[PDB]
Symmetry: C2
Subunit: 153 residues, 2 copies
């Protein structure tokens, strides 16, 4: 659909959470982006269906950088009101994955592992209350699922 419609989708999803959630998620994710990208790659390697698309160290470096780029894209949208930019990024990742035939089940597998790991970081962050950790975790799951939907189209 139109950028406008997709941007409105991200905005509607984000609007259910407060700017404190948007910022707490952006802070924790961006502070741990390399570790998150490292964990994602190890998750892929440990799964034969995903490892089927992996090869050498050069591709490992590219995957790590692109994951860091995606984490920045996803978490920047709501607090910067750059909905249209994030939405185009998701459609581009989807087009790149589809052209190489990455099955959606592996994308959702990776997204599930990211949701849990980000949520663990939030529960460990001393500066967040348990209320804040849970609300930000809900936001994380919601934008992650929303991104997966956009990629899949």
């Amino acid at each position: 659909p139109s950028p406008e419609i997709l941007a409105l989708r991200w905005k509607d999803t984000s609007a259910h959470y407060s700017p404190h959630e948007w910022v707490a998620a952006r802070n924790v994710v961006t502070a741990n982006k390399a570790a998150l990208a490292d964990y994602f790659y190890e998750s892929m390697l440990a799964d034969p269906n995903a490892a089927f698309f992996l090869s050498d160290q050069l591709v490992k470096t590219k995957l790590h950088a692109s994951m860091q780029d995606w984490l920045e894209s996803v978490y920047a949208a709501a607090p910067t009101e750059e909905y249209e930019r994030t939405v185009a990024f998701q459609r581009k990742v989807g087009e790149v994955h589809a052209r190489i035939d990455i099955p959606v089940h592996l994308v959702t597998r990776g997204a599930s592992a990211l949701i849990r790991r980000i949520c663990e970081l939030l529960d460990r962050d001393a500066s967040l209350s348990a209320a804040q950790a849970a609300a930000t975790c809900r936001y994380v799951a919601d934008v992650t699922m929303t991104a997966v939907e956009m990629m899949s189209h």
Copy 2:
């Protein structure tokens, strides 16, 4: 698509987790299904966009029962190999929601709140290790997102 293709999708997603995850999720969810359904309804009521589709106590009772039914459907599939039955249930819920124009963003909002709440129950369950809690939480997110996708089609 065909039941066969959708059933294979659920099977492929579920196959990434061990039967211990499938059973731990089913046990905790089914033991807390009414509380989960109660929490879901309170989540809807507290959100003006969702409350827009709520009315009286009679509908509250129907929503509570259907949520309990969905939780049983989702968590039964993998451990009983009843992929086709769960997959038909998701398409039916999708058809029911679409006919009444429930926006997808509110479905994903609810799914995010379910993922967090189920994951909290798993982290609190004394009989699960932290390793098991995290793996079962990943499974919960993965089948939840998978179900939302099927509903949305």
